[PDB]
Amino acid sequence: ARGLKKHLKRLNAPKHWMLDKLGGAFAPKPSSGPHKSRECLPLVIILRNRLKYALTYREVISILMQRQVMVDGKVRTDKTYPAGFMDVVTIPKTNESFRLLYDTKGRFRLHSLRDEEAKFKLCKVRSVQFGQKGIPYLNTYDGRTIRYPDPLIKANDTIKLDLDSNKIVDFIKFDVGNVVMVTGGRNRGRVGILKNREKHKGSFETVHIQDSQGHEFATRLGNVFTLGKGSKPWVSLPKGKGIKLSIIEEARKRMAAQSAT
Amino acid sequence: AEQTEKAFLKQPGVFLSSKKTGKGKRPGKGGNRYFKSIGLGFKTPREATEGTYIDKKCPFTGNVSIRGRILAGTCHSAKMNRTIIVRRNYLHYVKKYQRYEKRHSNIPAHISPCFRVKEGDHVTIGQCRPLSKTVRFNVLKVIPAGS
Amino acid sequence: GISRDSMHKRRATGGKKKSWRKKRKYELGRQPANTKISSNKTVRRIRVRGGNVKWRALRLDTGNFSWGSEAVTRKTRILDVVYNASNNELVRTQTLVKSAIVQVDAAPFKQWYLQHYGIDISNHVVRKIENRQADRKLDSHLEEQFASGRLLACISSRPGQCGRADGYILEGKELEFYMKKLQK
RNA sequence: CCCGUCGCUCCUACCGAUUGAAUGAUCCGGUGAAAUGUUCGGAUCGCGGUCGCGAGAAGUCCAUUGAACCUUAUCAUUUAGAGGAAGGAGAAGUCGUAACAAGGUUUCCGUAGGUGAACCUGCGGAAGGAUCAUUG
RNA sequence: ACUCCGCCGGCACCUUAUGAGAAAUCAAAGUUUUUGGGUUCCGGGGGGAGUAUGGUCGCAAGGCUGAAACUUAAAGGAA
RNA sequence: UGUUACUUUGAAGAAAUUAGAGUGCUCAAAGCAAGCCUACGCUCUGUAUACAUUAGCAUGGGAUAACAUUAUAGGA
RNA sequence: UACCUGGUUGAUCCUGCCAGUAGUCAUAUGCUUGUCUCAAAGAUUAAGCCAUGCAUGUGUAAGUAUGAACAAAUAGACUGUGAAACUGCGAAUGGCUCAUUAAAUCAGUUAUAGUUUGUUUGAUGGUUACUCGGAUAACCGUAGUAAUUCUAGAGCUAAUACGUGCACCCCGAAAGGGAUGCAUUUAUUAGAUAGCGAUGAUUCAUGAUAACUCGACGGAUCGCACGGCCGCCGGCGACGCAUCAUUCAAAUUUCUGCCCUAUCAACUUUCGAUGGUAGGAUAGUGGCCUACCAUGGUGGUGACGGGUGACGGAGAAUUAGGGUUCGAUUCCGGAGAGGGAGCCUGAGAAACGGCUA
Ligand SMILES: [K+]
Ligand SMILES: [K+]
Ligand SMILES: [K+]
Ligand SMILES: [K+]
Ligand SMILES: [K+]
Ligand SMILES: [K+]
Ligand SMILES: [K+]
Ligand SMILES: [K+]
Ligand SMILES: [K+]
Ligand SMILES: [K+]
Ligand SMILES: [K+]
Ligand SMILES: [Mg+2]
Ligand SMILES: [Mg+2]
Ligand SMILES: [Mg+2]
Ligand SMILES: [Mg+2]
Ligand SMILES: [Mg+2]
Ligand SMILES: [Mg+2]
Ligand SMILES: [Mg+2]
Ligand SMILES: [Mg+2]
Ligand SMILES: [Mg+2]
Ligand SMILES: [Mg+2]
Ligand SMILES: [Mg+2]
Ligand SMILES: [Mg+2]
Ligand SMILES: [Mg+2]
Ligand SMILES: [Mg+2]
Ligand SMILES: [Mg+2]
Ligand SMILES: [Mg+2]
Ligand SMILES: [Mg+2]
Ligand SMILES: [Mg+2]
Ligand SMILES: [Mg+2]
Ligand SMILES: [Mg+2]
Ligand SMILES: [Mg+2]
Ligand SMILES: [Mg+2]
Ligand SMILES: [Mg+2]
Ligand SMILES: [Mg+2]
Ligand SMILES: [Mg+2]
Ligand SMILES: [Mg+2]
Ligand SMILES: [Mg+2]
Ligand SMILES: [Mg+2]
Ligand SMILES: [Mg+2]
């Protein structure tokens, strides 16, 4: 190509969007924004495919152009705005407020929130370094830059960000014993306690996570996101609570549901 | 001395005409010879910390970082100036016959004056940025043949 | 035009490379500046990749030169190119390139030396000048060329890239090395 | 049952004087458009005090990149060729009878010479021989 | 020197199948659909043909390397 | 801290296709839907999972096998 | 479905092939054809040649209206709508095709501490001015040419167009003066230890200092709403400039992996072949290029050369297992726009529904 690609073929779109292959030749091309295009959920998918408020591509534009949808407390009018993990989506007219969290099968779930819990979000710290004039700053994995951070905050820590004051309220150091969620790979959406950190000089660092039921799984440091200090997350989790069930166990529940339901 | 080229060879950033003395200052400051550790558990040879050679492609006293793949092999050619050919021997799996065949690859690598090498010696090479048309590796350790 | 691609080169084995695509704009080169010493200063502005700017100096006469041991930098006139390690033909053409040995006017540094040490090469003022004179040392080789009004200097900038000819005054064993190259 | 020359028809390929031919590609060399950079140039325009300042076209100079064309050379592919000559096919040609029986000179291998043709002969070898056998 | 017993090595022969094989036959040509000790060379219907061409060796005779077009429903082994 | 192969487990790995779970498009090839009751709705509805040579990355194993090494020990 | 049958003999058992049998998201062709669902379709030969039409334009309350425009009103700059035109942006995506290309493309796997990146998102930008200047389009009216979104001259007038412009250290009779935003270029200096940040690893992030540059930088812009103090102050937005991070990406790059051919055994190196030093050029690494120096680099583990009716992969057909064959084509990557070459604009093109030869 001679420059930037503006189209996304439907079969090349991320699988966790769950787009039907015969729905059309194209999928929404995620706009540039805080999250990567492969780890986001464009507002058009949320409003039309997940919430059913819009029936067509055109109707999503009407909803957004009325300024009825907000992401992280700010109105967004871009149809392909890349809303991602921990983002807070608010729709004042419907009095609804959701947090984008992965279900245990690795797909984004619109977790309904209470009005009180919709005033903050969690962010993972990418790095901390000195800026111009020797002023320290930290940047996150959701594209945010915070100047004058607490000197104790380091890379891979999690910060609680208030969407009103736009300031760091509290932070969690990345250490063994905290509850974390997996944000990428095979184990995406699984919640457990960080049990070990295996460092390899020059290579990726591996982290061993143990589920509440004793199931242990590994992953890369880049796919970990601390949710709370100790064992209690600072955010509300969906029903599964990051517990991944075997297909045999899942089939057992389905069989029982038909007997009762 | 090491001044054998048409230009005067020196390390960048090491000021040699300072009125003050370099006694009690870190390498590369106060006119002291500059050297560094490359990490990954490799040791800085004594010949590079106390040497007088100038090599901007040296991994310990030059301006090149080691990052990427660390490979090992045997010195195949040591006839170039500060460059050797490293032969890497490996087995290629032939699927249909469920057997192996011996293959090899010649990897050019830069060798700093702090290392002594001869054909047949075992060498470890670390990847660096392109240093020439073919060289992408720097010698990090030499084990004499028969040791 | 000028290209920096490897497609025209031979393989490391020696075999030829058959062409499989046309030249790309993102691998181009450009004509050398060939900066010369001349009082008719000329620097042309070049638009480069990303919309950024390079300054190509065709002719220069002054430069910003630093006396390292004294930690003083002054703008001074470039007088002559005397030595070039790459190509002696760049010396007689008076081409300004990085690492070329040139002679610069010593007048701006003499004024600072007289204003700083009170020496040629107000009660509270004389108090400090004599205080600074205790730790004053001047290389004999460096002082010998102040009489002629010219200092040997090395260009540390790239005039064809930044449009300027900056450098530092030679001293120490570097000065000895080059003055031996000029001793003929 | 069977071998070859010779004679007739057709098919495939080969050799071949022609310094064969055609087509394509490549090397070297020659010439060289255009563009770009540089040098000079200063039509013209503007702005100050009939002199300055700035901008600047045509054109020109050197260099770079370099199409294109024209040689010689090489390679590739296709193709004509007097004549020479091979193989195969073609119910029911001529001359013999070489191989099959000890095939009427046992056959065969290597090599050499010779003869219309199969073949013949010399030398050494093999049995796949027509002898597994003479302490007679 | 000869006679008797035995050991190792060699050229062979005789009987036999519990073996193998299309059989002739083979104590290896056995220990193979119950398929694998190691390794080199080499064959893929009959012709065209060990021919043409190129290379290489030879003083030559020729040797080594070695096709295709085309043709054919058999040719061949043992009994 | 001699270097490897091999083996185990794991991470990373495009989708579509292939295998495969769920689902009565009337069946089917398919599709990724739908289902539940009858309210101003519900099931957080579903859109699983496996496979994926070789090379590379990381744990456990050390039989088999390769290379290297050994007595003027430059030995511990 | 882990399968065979006819054919050499008078008959027999073999070797061995010929023929038959079945499939192909496999093409063509023949004959035949009522209904439902689904669906490929000028790739193969000619990346041969193309008539005609169409395939890229674009307007918000928010850059610029005096149409001699419309509508509705009735001493005011304008302030209902708005053609045209300037300005801005886009046209580098998409679509098409498979010609060239055999460690090349490409695949998995790396690296950028080796770079650029309009936009999005986050953060960050010092202690005549009650607002400057000259042009030009539309329009207007003299035209030229057989002729083209071919073209000349004259009269007008705008801006978010164009050009401008308010906007600690040193010297020192401690007065006074110099420098003093951000960026640019060079040099000196700090960046410890085990006040003082990060990495497996950087004289790294970043600080201070001496100067440097004839710096498209640091708002002469627009909409809506009107309020609060006694002229002053002030709301919510739009657009734009610069820096860092982020996102969207590219470029280059590590390791391993590709079909047939030896009737291809040596190839490369004067004119770059392999490496070194110093430069030049580039967004940046690099013989990428120049000067000088060294004599290297590859090869029966098949270099080099030749063939391909060769784009690579995801995959496709058939498959007891192993395997054989195919892969122009809708997903990904690359490449090209009749053949070459060159280039402008731009964040991005060596662009072809752009230009030059
Ligand atoms: K590209
Ligand atoms: K006879
Ligand atoms: K006979
Ligand atoms: K005879
Ligand atoms: K015996
Ligand atoms: K554009
Ligand atoms: K790759
Ligand atoms: K490949
Ligand atoms: K470069
Ligand atoms: K070099
Ligand atoms: K642009
Ligand atoms: Mg495209
Ligand atoms: Mg790293
Ligand atoms: Mg007879
Ligand atoms: Mg007779
Ligand atoms: Mg006879
Ligand atoms: Mg017997
Ligand atoms: Mg067998
Ligand atoms: Mg045969
Ligand atoms: Mg079979
Ligand atoms: Mg019969
Ligand atoms: Mg058949
Ligand atoms: Mg009907
Ligand atoms: Mg326009
Ligand atoms: Mg080839
Ligand atoms: Mg490779
Ligand atoms: Mg620094
Ligand atoms: Mg260089
Ligand atoms: Mg040279
Ligand atoms: Mg293919
Ligand atoms: Mg092709
Ligand atoms: Mg393909
Ligand atoms: Mg083709
Ligand atoms: Mg097509
Ligand atoms: Mg494609
Ligand atoms: Mg192109
Ligand atoms: Mg065409
Ligand atoms: Mg073009
Ligand atoms: Mg077209
Ligand atoms: Mg196009």
Residue with tokens 């054998």: B4
A255 touches strand F (CB under 7 A): no
Q: Which of C72, C76, C78, C68 is nearest to C101 (CA)?
A: C78
Cα dihedral A181, A185, A187, A192 in deg (nearest 10):
-20
List the determination method.
Answer: cryo-EM
Query: Edge-to-edge strand order for the sheet containing A120-130?
Result: A145-147, A136-140, A120-130, A158-162, A168-172
Residue with tokens 């915070």: A146
The rounded distance, in Å, linking the Cα atoms of C170 and C148 is 16
Do C121 and C172 share a domain, yes or no?
A: no
The rounded distance, in Å, linking the Cα atoms of A11 and A15 is 8
Q: Which of A184, A133, A137, A138 is nearest to A157 (CA)?
A: A138
The rounded distance, in Å, linking the Cα atoms of A100 and B58 is 50
C123 touches strand D (CB under 7 A): no
Residue A121 near residue A86 (C-beta atoms within 8 A)? yes
Give the helix/strand (H/E) hosting C168.
Answer: strand C167-169
CB of B10 within 8 Å of a chain C CB? The answer is yes
> CA angle A120-A102-A38, nearest 5°?
100
Where are chain A's structural domains?
A: 1-116, 121-171, 174-244
Which tokens hold the place of A246? 């075997």
CB contact under 8 A, C135 and B19: yes
Chain C residue numbers with beta carbons less than 8 Å from the beta carbon of B19 are: 69, 135, 137
Give the helix/strand (H/E) hosting C76.
Answer: strand C72-83
The set of residues, in sequence order, having a beta carbon less than 8 Å from that of C82 and lying 6+ positions away, is C91, C101, C102, C103, C152, C182
Alpha helices (H) along C89-162 = 89-92, 107-117, 123-133, 140-144, 159-162
Q: Which of C144, C146, C120, C123 is nearest to C133 (CA)?
A: C120
Chain C residue numbers with beta carbons less than 8 Å from the beta carbon of B132 are: none
Q: Which of B110, B113, B117 is nearest to B138 (CA)?
A: B110
DSSP secondary structure code for residue A94 in this structure: G
> CA angle A172-A178-A180, nearest 5°?
90
Q: Which of C94, C109, C96 is nearest to C150 (CA)?
A: C109
The rounded distance, in Å, linking the Cα atoms of A179 and C55 is 56
Report the distance from CA of residue A60 to the C1' of nucleotide D12 in Å, as an integer.
77
The SS3 call for residue A258 is helix
The rounded distance, in Å, linking the Cα atoms of B138 and B115 is 11
Sort A98 into a burial class: Cβ within 10 Å, 0-12 / 13-18 / 19+: buried
Sort B62 into a burial class: Cβ within 10 Å, 0-12 / 13-18 / 19+: buried
Chain B residue numbers with beta carbons less than 8 Å from the beta carbon of A203 are: none
The rounded distance, in Å, linking the Cα atoms of A125 and A158 is 6
The rounded distance, in Å, linking the Cα atoms of C15 and C179 is 46
Residue A242 near residue A189 (C-beta atoms within 8 A)? yes
Q: Which of A126, A176, A128, A133 is nearest to A150 (CA)?
A: A128
Alpha helices (H) along A67-191 = none
The set of residues, in sequence order, having a beta carbon less than 8 Å from that of A163 and lying 6+ positions away, is A72, A73, A88, A118, A119, A120, A121
Do C81 and C37 share a domain, yes or no?
A: yes
The rounded distance, in Å, linking the Cα atoms of B139 and C161 is 34
The rounded distance, in Å, linking the Cα atoms of A218 and A197 is 10
The rounded distance, in Å, linking the Cα atoms of C167 and C155 is 4
Residue B138 near residue B56 (C-beta atoms within 8 A)? no
Q: How many domains does chain C have?
A: 3
The rounded distance, in Å, linking the Cα atoms of A217 and A224 is 12
How far is the centre of ligand 39, averaged over its atoms, from the C-alpha of C106 (Å)? Answer: 67
Residue A70's φ and ψ, nearest 5 degrees, are: -130, 140
- In sign, the C-alpha dihedral spanning C66, C72, C73, C79 is negative
Residues after which chain A is discontinuous, using a C–N cutoff of 2.5 Å: none
Report the distance from CA of residue A137 to the C1' of nucleotide G255 in Å, as an integer.
38
Residue C117 near residue C128 (C-beta atoms within 8 A)? no
Which tokens hold the place of B42? 């490799």
Report the distance from CA of residue C56 to the C1' of nucleotide G108 in Å, as an integer.
45
Do C63 and C131 share a domain, yes or no?
A: no
Chain B residue numbers with beta carbons less than 8 Å from the beta carbon of A201 are: 39-41
Residue A81: C-alpha distances to residues A120, A230, C168 (Å): 20, 34, 53
> How far apart, in Å, do the first and last CA atoms of chain A sit?
55
Residue B75 near residue B86 (C-beta atoms within 8 A)? yes
The SS3 call for residue A243 is coil
The rounded distance, in Å, linking the Cα atoms of B83 and B55 is 12
CB contact under 8 A, C85 and B6: yes
DSSP secondary structure code for residue A39 in this structure: G
> CA angle A210-A236-A244, nearest 5°?
35
The rounded distance, in Å, linking the Cα atoms of A105 and A18 is 12
Which chains have at least 3 CB atom pairs separated by less than 8 Å from chain A? B
Residue with tokens 């010369």: C36
Residue C128's φ and ψ, nearest 5 degrees, are: -90, -30
Report the amino acid identity of residue B107.
I
The set of residues, in sequence order, having a beta carbon less than 8 Å from that of C16 and lying 6+ positions away, is C10
The rounded distance, in Å, linking the Cα atoms of A191 and A215 is 11
Give the 3-state secondary structure of B88-135: EEEEEEECCCCEEEEEEEEEEEECCCCCCCCCCCEEEEEECCCCCCCC
The rounded distance, in Å, linking the Cα atoms of C156 and B90 is 47
Residue from C174, C176, C180, C181 whose CB has the most chain B CBs within 10 Å, to mutate: C174
Chain B nearest-CA residue for A200: B40
Domain hosting C15: range is 1-30
Do C91 and C158 share a domain, yes or no?
A: yes
Where are chain B's structural domains?
A: 1-147
The SS3 call for residue A50 is helix
Do C51 and C79 share a domain, yes or no?
A: yes
The rounded distance, in Å, linking the Cα atoms of A256 and A241 is 21
Report the distance from CA of residue C179 to the C1' of nucleotide G160 in Å, as an integer.
60
Name the nt closest to C3 by C-alpha to C1'.
G288
A199 CA to chain B: closest CA distance, Å?
12
Q: Which of A8, A65, A11 is nearest to A37 (CA)?
A: A8
